[PDB]
Design an enzyme around this catalytic site. Structure first.
Site, PDB file in Angstrom:
ATOM      1  CG  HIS A   1     -28.166   6.565 -20.282  1.00 56.44           C
ATOM      2  ND1 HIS A   1     -28.294   7.990 -19.966  1.00 56.44           N
ATOM      3  CD2 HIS A   1     -28.651   5.930 -19.180  1.00 56.44           C
ATOM      4  CE1 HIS A   1     -28.880   7.943 -18.768  1.00 56.44           C
ATOM      5  NE2 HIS A   1     -29.167   6.671 -18.297  1.00 56.44           N
TER       6      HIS A   1
ATOM      7  CB  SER B   1     -33.582  -1.818 -23.623  1.00 52.54           C
ATOM      8  OG  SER B   1     -32.615  -1.549 -22.716  1.00 52.54           O
TER       9      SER B   1
ATOM     10  CE  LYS C   1     -35.929 -11.379 -16.336  1.00 53.52           C
ATOM     11  NZ  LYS C   1     -37.112 -11.256 -17.090  1.00 53.52           N
ATOM     12  CG  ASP C   2     -29.840  -8.140 -14.605  1.00 54.54           C
ATOM     13  OD1 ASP C   2     -30.464  -8.938 -15.369  1.00 54.54           O
ATOM     14  OD2 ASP C   2     -29.437  -6.945 -14.909  1.00 54.54           O
TER      15      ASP C   2
ATOM     16  CD  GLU D   1      -9.399 -23.852 -26.048  1.00 55.36           C
ATOM     17  OE1 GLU D   1     -10.589 -24.246 -25.617  1.00 55.36           O
ATOM     18  OE2 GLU D   1      -8.202 -24.600 -25.378  1.00 55.36           O
TER      19      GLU D   1
HETATM   20  C1  HEM Z   1     -17.196  -7.335 -23.504  1.00 60.79           C
HETATM   21  C2  HEM Z   1     -18.297  -7.130 -24.466  1.00 60.79           C
HETATM   22  C3  HEM Z   1     -19.605  -6.626 -24.259  1.00 60.79           C
HETATM   23  C4  HEM Z   1     -20.329  -6.125 -23.135  1.00 60.79           C
HETATM   24  C5  HEM Z   1     -19.701  -6.108 -21.702  1.00 60.79           C
HETATM   25  C6  HEM Z   1     -21.688  -5.550 -23.176  1.00 60.79           C
HETATM   26  C7  HEM Z   1     -22.420  -5.175 -22.426  1.00 60.79           C
HETATM   27  C8  HEM Z   1     -23.566  -4.580 -22.696  1.00 60.79           C
HETATM   28  C9  HEM Z   1     -24.874  -4.523 -21.617  1.00 60.79           C
HETATM   29  C10 HEM Z   1     -24.728  -4.613 -20.215  1.00 60.79           C
HETATM   30  C11 HEM Z   1     -26.121  -4.307 -22.471  1.00 60.79           C
HETATM   31  C12 HEM Z   1     -27.166  -3.720 -21.913  1.00 60.79           C
HETATM   32  C13 HEM Z   1     -27.980  -5.020 -21.345  1.00 60.79           C
HETATM   33  C14 HEM Z   1     -28.444  -5.837 -22.487  1.00 60.79           C
HETATM   34  O1  HEM Z   1     -29.350  -5.555 -23.453  1.00 60.79           O
HETATM   35  O2  HEM Z   1     -28.086  -7.167 -22.513  1.00 60.79           O
HETATM   36  C15 HEM Z   1     -25.744  -4.386 -23.816  1.00 60.79           C
HETATM   37  C16 HEM Z   1     -26.299  -4.141 -24.762  1.00 60.79           C
HETATM   38  C17 HEM Z   1     -26.143  -4.001 -26.148  1.00 60.79           C
HETATM   39  N1  HEM Z   1     -25.070  -4.664 -26.706  1.00 60.79           N
HETATM   40 FE1  HEM Z   1     -23.444  -5.188 -25.823  1.00 60.79          FE
HETATM   41  N2  HEM Z   1     -21.852  -5.935 -24.886  1.00 60.79           N
HETATM   42  C18 HEM Z   1     -20.622  -6.378 -25.100  1.00 60.79           C
HETATM   43  C19 HEM Z   1     -20.330  -6.595 -26.576  1.00 60.79           C
HETATM   44  C20 HEM Z   1     -21.284  -6.346 -27.612  1.00 60.79           C
HETATM   45  C21 HEM Z   1     -21.350  -6.923 -29.077  1.00 60.79           C
HETATM   46  C22 HEM Z   1     -19.948  -7.682 -29.253  1.00 60.79           C
HETATM   47  C23 HEM Z   1     -22.396  -6.460 -29.756  1.00 60.79           C
HETATM   48  C24 HEM Z   1     -22.403  -6.397 -31.274  1.00 60.79           C
HETATM   49  C25 HEM Z   1     -22.034  -6.731 -32.345  1.00 60.79           C
HETATM   50  C26 HEM Z   1     -22.967  -5.754 -28.965  1.00 60.79           C
HETATM   51  C27 HEM Z   1     -24.282  -5.012 -29.324  1.00 60.79           C
HETATM   52  C28 HEM Z   1     -25.155  -4.756 -28.051  1.00 60.79           C
HETATM   53  C29 HEM Z   1     -26.479  -4.020 -28.378  1.00 60.79           C
HETATM   54  C30 HEM Z   1     -27.024  -3.808 -29.823  1.00 60.79           C
HETATM   55  C31 HEM Z   1     -27.031  -3.972 -27.576  1.00 60.79           C
HETATM   56  C32 HEM Z   1     -28.640  -3.252 -27.118  1.00 60.79           C
HETATM   57  C33 HEM Z   1     -29.725  -4.192 -27.265  1.00 60.79           C
HETATM   58  C34 HEM Z   1     -31.020  -3.843 -26.792  1.00 60.79           C
HETATM   59  O3  HEM Z   1     -31.274  -3.146 -26.048  1.00 60.79           O
HETATM   60  O4  HEM Z   1     -31.813  -4.537 -27.719  1.00 60.79           O
HETATM   61  N3  HEM Z   1     -22.565  -5.684 -27.394  1.00 60.79           N
HETATM   62  N4  HEM Z   1     -24.305  -4.749 -23.921  1.00 60.79           N
HETATM   63  C1  LIG Z   2      -9.695 -11.985 -35.237  1.00 61.03           C
HETATM   64  C2  LIG Z   2      -8.743 -13.229 -34.943  1.00 61.03           C
HETATM   65  C3  LIG Z   2      -7.648 -13.157 -34.588  1.00 61.03           C
HETATM   66  C4  LIG Z   2      -6.805 -14.178 -34.283  1.00 61.03           C
HETATM   67  C5  LIG Z   2      -5.189 -14.143 -34.106  1.00 61.03           C
HETATM   68  C6  LIG Z   2      -7.427 -15.517 -34.655  1.00 61.03           C
HETATM   69  N1  LIG Z   2      -6.901 -16.762 -34.420  1.00 61.03           N
HETATM   70  C7  LIG Z   2      -7.714 -17.792 -34.783  1.00 61.03           C
HETATM   71  S1  LIG Z   2      -7.031 -19.684 -34.876  1.00 61.03           S
HETATM   72  C8  LIG Z   2      -5.568 -19.980 -33.765  1.00 61.03           C
HETATM   73  C9  LIG Z   2      -4.945 -21.387 -33.516  1.00 61.03           C
HETATM   74  C10 LIG Z   2      -4.635 -22.338 -34.538  1.00 61.03           C
HETATM   75  C11 LIG Z   2      -4.604 -21.733 -35.936  1.00 61.03           C
HETATM   76  C12 LIG Z   2      -4.096 -23.453 -34.263  1.00 61.03           C
HETATM   77  C13 LIG Z   2      -4.305 -23.904 -32.908  1.00 61.03           C
HETATM   78  C14 LIG Z   2      -4.632 -22.938 -31.574  1.00 61.03           C
HETATM   79  C15 LIG Z   2      -4.990 -21.832 -32.146  1.00 61.03           C
HETATM   80  N2  LIG Z   2      -5.397 -20.923 -30.980  1.00 61.03           N
HETATM   81  N3  LIG Z   2      -4.500 -19.889 -30.557  1.00 61.03           N
HETATM   82  N4  LIG Z   2      -5.263 -19.324 -29.351  1.00 61.03           N
HETATM   83  N5  LIG Z   2      -6.345 -20.117 -29.318  1.00 61.03           N
HETATM   84  C16 LIG Z   2      -7.512 -19.862 -28.072  1.00 61.03           C
HETATM   85  C17 LIG Z   2      -6.724 -21.244 -30.159  1.00 61.03           C
HETATM   86  O1  LIG Z   2      -7.423 -21.797 -30.367  1.00 61.03           O
HETATM   87  S2  LIG Z   2      -9.177 -17.322 -35.031  1.00 61.03           S
HETATM   88  C18 LIG Z   2      -8.766 -15.688 -35.001  1.00 61.03           C
HETATM   89  C19 LIG Z   2      -9.556 -14.398 -35.155  1.00 61.03           C
HETATM   90  C1  LIG Z   3     -26.901  -6.944 -10.731  1.00 65.74           C
HETATM   91  C2  LIG Z   3     -26.521  -5.807 -11.946  1.00 65.74           C
HETATM   92  C3  LIG Z   3     -26.271  -4.628 -11.175  1.00 65.74           C
HETATM   93  C4  LIG Z   3     -25.768  -3.396 -12.338  1.00 65.74           C
HETATM   94  C5  LIG Z   3     -25.553  -2.134 -11.532  1.00 65.74           C
HETATM   95  C6  LIG Z   3     -26.336  -3.536 -13.370  1.00 65.74           C
HETATM   96  N1  LIG Z   3     -25.830  -2.506 -14.524  1.00 65.74           N
HETATM   97  C7  LIG Z   3     -26.412  -2.761 -15.544  1.00 65.74           C
HETATM   98  S1  LIG Z   3     -26.588  -1.784 -16.981  1.00 65.74           S
HETATM   99  C8  LIG Z   3     -27.871  -0.629 -16.974  1.00 65.74           C
HETATM  100  C9  LIG Z   3     -28.008   0.145 -18.252  1.00 65.74           C
HETATM  101  C10 LIG Z   3     -27.402   1.255 -18.650  1.00 65.74           C
HETATM  102  C11 LIG Z   3     -26.483   1.857 -17.521  1.00 65.74           C
HETATM  103  C12 LIG Z   3     -27.564   2.179 -19.604  1.00 65.74           C
HETATM  104  C13 LIG Z   3     -28.791   1.816 -20.589  1.00 65.74           C
HETATM  105  C14 LIG Z   3     -29.345   0.621 -20.476  1.00 65.74           C
HETATM  106  C15 LIG Z   3     -29.065  -0.147 -19.323  1.00 65.74           C
HETATM  107  N2  LIG Z   3     -29.989  -1.225 -19.364  1.00 65.74           N
HETATM  108  N3  LIG Z   3     -31.240  -1.129 -19.775  1.00 65.74           N
HETATM  109  N4  LIG Z   3     -31.816  -2.394 -19.828  1.00 65.74           N
HETATM  110  N5  LIG Z   3     -31.048  -3.251 -19.211  1.00 65.74           N
HETATM  111  C16 LIG Z   3     -31.227  -4.769 -19.188  1.00 65.74           C
HETATM  112  C17 LIG Z   3     -29.747  -2.556 -19.128  1.00 65.74           C
HETATM  113  O1  LIG Z   3     -28.690  -3.432 -18.850  1.00 65.74           O
HETATM  114  S2  LIG Z   3     -27.305  -4.350 -15.616  1.00 65.74           S
HETATM  115  C18 LIG Z   3     -26.881  -4.816 -13.676  1.00 65.74           C
HETATM  116  C19 LIG Z   3     -26.907  -5.774 -13.100  1.00 65.74           C
END
Ligand code: HEM
Ligand SMILES: Cc1cc(C)c2nc(SCc3c(C)cccc3-n3nnn(C)c3=O)sc2c1
Ligand SMILES: Cc1cc(C)c2nc(SCc3c(C)cccc3-n3nnn(C)c3=O)sc2c1
Ligand SMILES: CCCCCCCCCCCCCCCCCC(=O)OC[C@H](COP(=O)([O-])OCC(O)COP(=O)([O-])OC[C@@H](COC(=O)CCCCCCCCCCCCCCCCC)OC(=O)CCCCCCCCCCCCCCCCC)OC(=O)CCCCCCCCCCCCCCCCC
Ligand SMILES: CCCCCCCCCCCCCCCCCC(=O)OC[C@H](COP(=O)([O-])OCC(O)COP(=O)([O-])OC[C@@H](COC(=O)CCCCCCCCCCCCCCCCC)OC(=O)CCCCCCCCCCCCCCCCC)OC(=O)CCCCCCCCCCCCCCCCC
Ligand SMILES: CCCCCCCC/C=C\CCCCCCCC(=O)OC[C@H](COP(=O)(O)OCCN)OC(=O)CCCCCCC/C=C\CCCCCCCC
Ligand code: HEC
Ligand code: HEM
Ligand code: HEM
Ligand code: HEM
Lengths: 49, 106, 49, 79, 378, 49, 62, 142, 54
Positions: E200, E204, E226-227, E270
């Site tokens: 925020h 974006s 759109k979402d 998996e």
């Molecule tokens: C449970 C996991 C996550 C949730 C719920 C989440 C949620 C969100 C949401 C709602 C946005 C704003 C909308 C969008 O651009 O799609 C966003 C943006 C972003 N997220 Fe995530 N995210 C997650 C995981 C991650 C991970 C794993 C990464 C990277 C390693 C990441 C990096 C970013 C970045 C860099 C943005 C900004 C992108 C841009 O504006 O171009 N997030 N995230």
């Molecule tokens: C960060 C992180 C942590 C953990 C702990 C991890 N572990 C795996 S592989 C585990 C596995 C094996 C070796 C054999 C059969 C089934 C499963 N297995 N267990 N859970 N699920 C969904 C599976 O596919 S990558 C990885 C990455």
């Molecule tokens: C249907 C629905 C409803 C809700 C309530 C909703 N809320 C979000 S998070 C909004 C946001 C925040 C809070 C802060 C910074 C950036 C963005 N942001 N800006 N662009 N986009 C694609 C973003 O997600 S998605 C979405 C979809």
């Protein structure tokens, strides 16, 4: 000047019969704004799911 | 800095210019630079007429990308008419940052 | 431990996206369960209900 | 901190727009749409497709040197 | 009085979702952030239903899962929602990370570093849940991790006889696996709120890489509609899997109960853990295996300082785009190799593709961006 | 790249903080020896057994 | 300039916005009257003589 | 479990409540097992009680062929040949594994046509709002 | 600068608990609001232990 600013032509986009710009906005709003807004009619009775 | 095969390398620079496609959105090379804190100081040092030309070219390209369209081919930026308008202002901002940094260690 | 023979695919009558199970072929299959096996094999999770 | 009246400074540009109720829903769909996706695809594929063609030639060779070693040995079972 | 701007609760909602300035040229690759937030809420509600009927005891763990699929009303639809909803979470998460890598979104430094933490916490959560049903993959999946977790040099064997309750395998064993698996999704929720608080501050990024403060539009109504549309198209695909093929992504061998006595013909995790498993089995060591597994997620945090290009995104960089999809076609290779047995062709292909995953990110990408700078004269 | 840490008087700043930093490595040698009761260095001093 | 029948409901009810948010409630009716004629009847037609209530007339003869 | 070994040559006979769901091949595997018993090829030997079956992991099964022609009588008049009885313990034992099979496929049709109302009409609401931006024109007059 | 006033998370903590203006003559009858918040956290952690064995 500001008298050289006119709107470019938008007749590529208009609801088909309203392009006849001679008749005036009295019969061409009686039946123009609604059937894709009946698409809002089914998107609620169907939104109930 | 070769002198005989700088005709070969002039052709590779033209090929890369067309394969990148900011010219099809009507952009110049300095429009696409990433704005760090250094580039943001060179932008606010530009004269008023060059700043206004850059804001409209960016707005128009952002509007073409929303619609998935490009310009007609008669309006594509040519390789020999791309003006590097931002490069002299950026070299001076970088040269002043190196001087505050050599002063702080000595 | 060299190579397996994998089973071919038979046209079962429940192999469609909306195809049901034949409930007279289930009825005749419980009686082959309860007269041929049920003696070497268990079925711990299914009741008469 | 960054709301609408505080984002940039801009001079001399003008915008014209129509109401959504003055426009028909599909101006073109299939006469504009088909040649536009055919040139968006021509620009893509010579960057995206050749890595996945190399995965295909490794999958096909790798699942053909496993079957020749898991006991397809008529002439490789000699006294 | 506009009550949207003066009420203490409605102000926060208005600044975050209604009047937020957003770029106008945002693609549908920017849809997957709110899809991840839908997938997380779905896994929480469905998991809270299964936890009232599950029993964590190695004599009755497999039997309490068959009971809900046969006896409890609507237990079969809720169980297969949970197993298939976890595959839906991991496919949206890999699209999300690949987006931020192609467009250069890692330049938002505090947003990118909270994201790498969130990636570890969902991978550990999904591992604990697959132990809980106790079939023959929950057994031989748990032991492969925890004899690899005895190769930590000074505290390793201290940590392996803590998670089983102190014993080898018994009733109190899966009380600790279950309690970790209960708690971690609620920490993931708190880290995702902080994640959006740092975004925020800038707004974006957009597909061009260029700042767009001269072309903003309000978030409502343009990206609220759109979402919603993308979320409905995701609930359609998920129910095609629950109602027409609920066993397509799983393995049949997990319908046999865990037995240290019998023998499973293969060990296959998996599909979304199969790439990490292929990197493990290419290292003939057990300290250098757990190191290279943890270094394949932790290499994401070096992406901000490995950036040597003058431009932010890959839209105008054609040589960096050939390397981006060489990297995607290398993670497909490592997923296939991870589900194959360990013989001659799949042993050299597996280690020549573990080298290529680190050679592209660390060496070939920063050199290719400098060649592009020089062909444009910066 | 990280020759920002390379100055003629920047390594002078390590000379006046390492006498404070000479010691809190010996807090870990005394603080979880307390906490987790390590029997290794309870062999050390005749105060404690 | 004879138009097509779009404005059935633009003037009377869907203008006061009352029936725009009411059509989720007032407009909840008679489509679970109308879609048994679909899904249920298509289901028993693809599977004809295979379900229980098809064949149950045999042992239900008391 | 211990009496079960000695009554069956050391081999334990498996539970059948999940047997088609727990095999790589389902009821295609169970059908090819029961009707695929044959004689050993020239080169292989077997134990004292142990039979050759080519569709079983490692040809040697500790299971005598349990079905042949006229093993039982159906109360329908259906001729109880060998292939008819194997077809019916693949249908039962598919129901036993998946007792929700038919209810599953009928909810899948009540979802596919009540999404066919909801999806094309949220798409038209989206296209109505975005037409303001898709038709805009821009001019620059320095 | 002052990181208590410019960091996005530390700003919220500083405005709510550190730099908050409060009356100077507040009694110990005003103690029981944070005591209620301690009693609620205690009931949650202890109750999550009992629910694994009930
Ligand atoms: C449970 C996991 C996550 C949730 C719920 C989440 C949620 C969100 C949401 C709602 C946005 C704003 C909308 C969008 O651009 O799609 C966003 C943006 C972003 N997220 Fe995530 N995210 C997650 C995981 C991650 C991970 C794993 C990464 C990277 C390693 C990441 C990096 C970013 C970045 C860099 C943005 C900004 C992108 C841009 O504006 O171009 N997030 N995230
Ligand atoms: C960060 C992180 C942590 C953990 C702990 C991890 N572990 C795996 S592989 C585990 C596995 C094996 C070796 C054999 C059969 C089934 C499963 N297995 N267990 N859970 N699920 C969904 C599976 O596919 S990558 C990885 C990455
Ligand atoms: C249907 C629905 C409803 C809700 C309530 C909703 N809320 C979000 S998070 C909004 C946001 C925040 C809070 C802060 C910074 C950036 C963005 N942001 N800006 N662009 N986009 C694609 C973003 O997600 S998605 C979405 C979809
Ligand atoms: C399934 C599991 C996912 C769950 C689905 C939930 C719903 C998700 C959703 O709403 O849609 C997003 C999702 C992705 O669609 P998209 O590619 O982002 O759509 C195009 C966007 O406009 C994005 O635009 P784009 O640039 O990515 O389009 C690709 C490409 C060209 O794309 C094409 O080849 C032709 C365009 C056809 C549509 C493209 C969609 C497929 C790509 O475009 C261009 O080359 C033009 C850009 C600049 C070049 C200059 C040319 C001027 C114009 O669609 C899905 O429903 C998911 C299905 C699986 C797709 C993703 C998995 C593979 C990765
Ligand atoms: C170039 C690569 C990117 C550069 C990284 C800088 C920005 C990323 C970042 O924030 O790092 C997080 C942080 C690292 O920064 P740091 O440890 O705070 O640095 C010490 C600063 O000198 C200490 O200065 P400070 O400004 O960080 O002090 C304010 C500090 C203190 O303020 C607070 O933490 C607020 C109190 C939160 C706890 C509330 C009570 C408990 C609930 O605020 C934070 O630490 C916020 C970050 C924590 C996010 C999660 C919040 C938990 C909820 O997290 C990590 O340890 C790993 C992720 C970043 C590692 C990348 C660095 C390369 C290795
Ligand atoms: C592990 C399992 C991984 C599962 C995911 C596998 C998915 C396969 C990807 C196949 C889809 C191909 C996308 C089609 C789009 C395409 O190629 O068109 C090119 C098109 C051109 O668009 P612009 O650059 O905006 O225009 C530039 C001007 N040239 O480029 C794009 O669309 C780029 C899209 C960016 C990527 C977004 C999603 C990333 C895709 C794959 C994710 C895989 C993960 C990779 C690493 C993640 C690690 C967790
Ligand atoms: C009197 C003995 C006996 C009868 C009757 C018998 N079986 Fe078996 N069956 C076995 C034994 C013993 C095993 C264990 C085989 C082994 O390990 O070699 C077995 C194993 C199986 C397996 C598992 C094979 C595998 O891959 O694990 C299936 C399926 C099977 N039987 C089907 C049936 C069906 C269907 C019937 C009857 C309608 C049946 N059996 C009747 C003795 C019997
Ligand atoms: C990000 C969130 C989550 C993910 C990715 C996840 C993943 C999983 C997975 C993969 C399984 C194995 C299921 C199978 O294959 O049979 C599982 C089981 C289980 N999960 Fe989750 N889970 C999540 C959240 C939760 C939560 C929050 C709870 C409880 C409050 C929960 C409760 C359970 C229970 C009780 C089981 C065992 C029952 C069963 O196997 O169906 N889950 N989880
Ligand atoms: C779980 C329940 C509650 C919690 C955690 C809670 C917490 C707090 C806290 C921390 C304060 C500020 C400090 C203080 O003045 O003590 C406060 C103030 C206050 N609370 Fe509560 N409270 C709870 C229930 C209630 C109830 C039941 C009422 C009244 C019906 C109430 C009414 C008030 C009022 C009026 C104040 C401001 C008092 C003043 O400043 O003079 N609260 N509460
Ligand atoms: C405001 C919070 C709470 C209050 C006032 C409260 C109150 C009570 C009371 C009065 C009992 C009866 C105990 C007895 O007299 O023997 C009880 C029992 C119980 N509570 Fe709570 N509780 C709270 C929160 C929780 C939470 C959050 C959980 C679980 C996550 C929980 C789990 C249990 C369990 C499992 C019992 C089992 C019976 C027993 O242990 O006696 N409680 N609670």
């Amino acid at each position: 000047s500001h008298t050289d600013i006119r709107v470019p032509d938008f007749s590529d986009y208009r609801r088909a019969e309203v392009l006849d710009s001679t008749k005036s906005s009295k019969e061409s709003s009686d039946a123009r704004k609604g059937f894709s807004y009946l698409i809002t009619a089914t998107t609620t009775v169907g939104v109930a799911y | 800095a070769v002198a005989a095969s700088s005709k070969w390398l002039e052709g590779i620079r033209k090929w890369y210019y067309n394969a990148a496609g900011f010219n099809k959105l009507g952009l110049m090379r300095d429009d696409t630079i990433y704005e760090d804190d250094d580039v943001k100081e060179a932008i606010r040092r530009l004269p008023e007429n060059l700043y206004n030309d850059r804001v409209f070219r960016i707005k128009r390209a952002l509007d073409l990308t929303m619609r998935q369209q490009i310009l007609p081919k008669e309006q594509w930026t040519k390789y020999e008419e791309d003006k590097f308008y931002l490069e002299p202002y950026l070299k001076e901002v970088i040269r002043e940052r190196k001087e505050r940094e050599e002063w702080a260690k000595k | 431990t060299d190579l397996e023979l994998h089973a071919p695919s038979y046209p079962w009558s429940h192999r469609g996206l909306l195809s049901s199970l034949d409930h007279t072929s289930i009825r005749r299959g419980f009686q082959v369960y309860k007269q041929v096996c049920s003696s070497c094999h268990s079925m711990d999770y299914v009741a008469y209900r | 901190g960054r709301e609408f009246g505080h984002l940039t400074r801009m001079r001399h540009v003008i915008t014209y727009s129509l109401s959504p109720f003055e426009q028909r829903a599909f101006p073109h769909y299939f006469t504009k749409g088909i040649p536009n996706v055919l040139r968006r695809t021509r620009a893509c594929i010579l960057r995206v497709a050749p890595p996945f063609v190399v995965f295909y030639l490794v999958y096909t060779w790798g699942t053909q040197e496993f079957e020749k070693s898991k006991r397809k040995n008529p002439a490789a079972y000699e006294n | 009085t506009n009550i949207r701007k003066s009420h203490p609760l409605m102000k926060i909602i208005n600044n975050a979702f209604i009047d937020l300035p957003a770029p106008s040229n945002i693609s549908s690759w920017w849809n997957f952030g709110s899809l991840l937030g839908i997938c997380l809420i779905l896994q929480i509600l469905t998991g809270l239903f299964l936890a009232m009927h599950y029993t964590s005891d190695t004599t009755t763990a497999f039997s309490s899962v068959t009971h809900i699929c046969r006896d409890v009303n609507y237990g079969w639809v809720i169980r297969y929602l949970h197993a298939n909803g976890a595959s839906m979470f991991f496919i949206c998460l890999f699209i999300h990370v690949g987006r931020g890598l192609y467009y250069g979104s890692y330049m938002f430094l505090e947003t990118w570093n909270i994201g790498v933490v969130l990636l570890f916490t969902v991978m550990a959560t999904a591992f604990m849940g697959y132990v809980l049903p106790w079939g023959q993959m929950s057994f031989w999946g748990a032991t492969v991790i925890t004899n690899l977790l005895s190769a930590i040099p000074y505290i390793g064997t201290d940590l392996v006889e803590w998670i089983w309750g102190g014993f080898s395998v018994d009733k109190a064993t899966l009380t600790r696996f279950f309690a970790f698996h209960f708690i971690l999704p609620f920490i993931i929720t708190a880290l995702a709120a902080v994640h959006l608080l740092f975004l925020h501050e800038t707004g974006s990024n957009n597909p061009t890489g260029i700042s767009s403060d001269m072309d903003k539009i309000p978030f409502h109504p343009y990206y609220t509609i759109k979402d919603i549309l993308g979320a409905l198209f995701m609930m359609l695909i998920l129910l095609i899997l629950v109602l027409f093929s609920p066993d397509l992504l799983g393995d049949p061998d997990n319908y046999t109960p865990a037995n240290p006595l019998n023998t499973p013909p293969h060990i296959k995790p998996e599909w979304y853990f199969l790439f990490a498993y292929a990197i493990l089995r290419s290292i003939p060591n057990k300290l250098g295996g757990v190191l290279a597994l943890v270094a394949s997620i932790l290499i994401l945090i070096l992406m901000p300082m490995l950036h040597t290009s003058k431009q932010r995104s890959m839209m105008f960089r054609p040589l960096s785009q050939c390397l981006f999809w060489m990297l995607v076609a290398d993670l497909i290779t490592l997923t296939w190799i991870g589900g194959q047995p360990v013989e001659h062709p799949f042993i050299i292909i597996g280690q020549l593709a573990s080298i290529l995953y680190f050679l592209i990110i660390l060496v070939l990408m920063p050199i290719t961006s400098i060649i592009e700078n020089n062909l444009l004269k910066w | 790249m990280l020759s920002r840490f390379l100055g003629p008087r920047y390594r002078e700043l390590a000379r006046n903080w390492i006498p404070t930093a000479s010691m809190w490595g010996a807090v870990g040698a005394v603080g979880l020896v307390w906490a987790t009761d390590w029997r290794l260095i309870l062999d050390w001093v005749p105060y404690i057994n | 300039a004879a138009p097509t029948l779009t404005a059935r409901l633009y003037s009377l009810l869907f203008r006061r916005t009352s029936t725009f948010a009411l059509t989720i409630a007032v407009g909840a009716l008679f489509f679970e009257r109308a879609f048994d004629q679909g899904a249920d009847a298509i289901y028993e037609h693809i599977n004809q003589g295979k379900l229980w209530k098809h064949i149950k007339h045999k042992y239900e003869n008391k | 479990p211990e009496a079960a070994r000695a009554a069956n040559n050391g081999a334990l006979p498996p539970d059948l409540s999940y047997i088609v769901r727990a095999r790589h091949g389902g009821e295609d595997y169970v059908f090819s097992l029961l009707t695929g018993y044959c004689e050993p090829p020239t080169g292989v030997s077997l134990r004292e009680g142990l039979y050759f079956n080519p569709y079983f992991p490692g040809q040697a099964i500790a299971m005598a062929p349990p079905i042949y022609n006229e093993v039982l009588e159906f109360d329908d008049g259906t001729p109880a040949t060998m292939s008819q009885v194997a077809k019916d313990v693949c249908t039962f034992l598919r129901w036993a594994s998946e007792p929700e099979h038919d209810h599953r496929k009928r909810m899948g049709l009540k979802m596919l046509m009540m999404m066919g109302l909801l999806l094309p009409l949220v798409y038209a609401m989206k296209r109505h709002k975005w037409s303001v931006l898709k038709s805009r024109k821009l001019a620059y007059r320095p």
